[PDB]
Design a protein around this ligand. Structure first.
Ligand SMILES: O=P(O)(O)OC[C@@H](O)CO
Ligand SMILES: O=P(O)(O)OC[C@@H](O)CO
Lengths: 215, 219
């Protein structure tokens, strides 16, 4: 599934037993995102028909359908915007297949999550701020994805609505604290693509139910 | 349609240029005139340029006035500071985003390679780069950020044509701009061999007759 525009629901993985992985991959979810050990999980996912993406956070493992490359737009440090990216392309640029690679314009909005701390993300943003990042991602930078990252916490659907209004061709991903079908549905009204991570490990039945709720 | 630009002149709105020179400049056959302090001064120069049909772009390096055909927005790719990569841009779009026509806006992925120029000092640009570094920046602009323009900035000095050659090899859909130290037709011709678009600035004020001759050398 290299056509990311059709994704409505995706699951994101970080141990996970075969039974849960099997149910996950056969759930009707549009993709499974992995965010030597990686190869093993990939091979296990390949037993199924679901598209498998690798979200690249370090300076590239073969076998995936899509490679998602975060750019932390609201990071106060150039290394999470261009630095690691430059280092990676300098080292591996000759052998990269860019047709398989999709940039994600991240806006990290949960101060308590590890990514926010690692990247020094300015999370204290009003809706005007986020809308401005969304415009930069589409109209200055030309990224296929703008990603609202609330990882660990559930955000405000009315904010997600405002961001979607500001976007046109750039796809809006939302992720963070979706644990019930109702939470999934509400974000999915506005976000193009809803991402469910943590609930997989803590409340599997409900995490699974988010697929049908998004439809 | 910036894709057809082969030669462009860049004017400093803070430096004076009399009407006769401005006329000869605008009717020289250049593909565009780029204005690169105050809004009163930018508009006044725009009003004067509008006497002619040459496309006029504004290069926004600080917070900006409507009326231009194209807005060229530098992003300093080789800056060590987030402010010159996205920060200042965010502040500007936050205030003026509602009134921007995105069809008129083109980001320029700048790679500043002259350590002695004012921009390199202000933006804290790492100019100490080998050709691989520069190519990687070009590739990022082409494939990751998908910016309309990649800009090799040598402002004040004439760069090396073999460098812009290799960078051009890495680009496809992103347009390659070159600017820096172009005074002679030979300098203009040689960069135009590899760069999609050649930018002539300082020579306008320091060597006007020579600046005008660069047009034909490219086109
Ligand atoms: O873990 P959760 O909160 O579901 O977040 C999903 C995804 O955005 C995490 O990167
Ligand atoms: O002043 P010169 O060296 O012509 O440079 C042209 C332009 O690239 C300046 O930003």
């Amino acid at each position: 599934m290299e056509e990311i525009r059709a994704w409505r629901h995706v699951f994101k993985l970080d141990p996970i037993d075969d039974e849960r992985l099997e149910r996950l991959c056969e759930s009707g979810t549009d993709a499974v995102i992995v965010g030597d050990n990686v190869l093993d999980l990939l091979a296990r996912i390949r037993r199924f028909s679901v598209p498998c993406a690798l979200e690249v956070t370090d300076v590239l493992t073969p076998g995936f359908d899509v490679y998602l490359v975060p750019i932390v737009l609201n990071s106060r440090q150039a290394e999470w915007i261009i630095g690691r990216h430059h280092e990676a392309v300098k080292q591996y640029g000759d052998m990269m297949n860019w047709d398989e690679i999709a940039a994600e314009g991240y806006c990290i909005l949960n101060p308590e999550c590890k990514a926010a701390k690692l990247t020094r993300a300015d999370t204290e943003l009003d809706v005007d701020d986020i809308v401005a990042y969304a415009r930069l991602a589409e109209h200055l930078y030309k990224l296929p994805i703008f990603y609202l990252e609330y990882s660990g916490v559930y955000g405000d659907p009315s904010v997600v609505e405002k961001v979607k209004q500001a976007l046109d061709q750039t796809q809006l991903f939302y992720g963070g604290g979706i644990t019930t079908p109702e939470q999934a549905e509400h974000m999915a009204r506005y976000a193009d693509t809803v991402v469910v991570g943590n609930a997989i490990y803590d409340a599997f039945e409900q995490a699974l139910a988010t697929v049908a709720a998004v439809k």
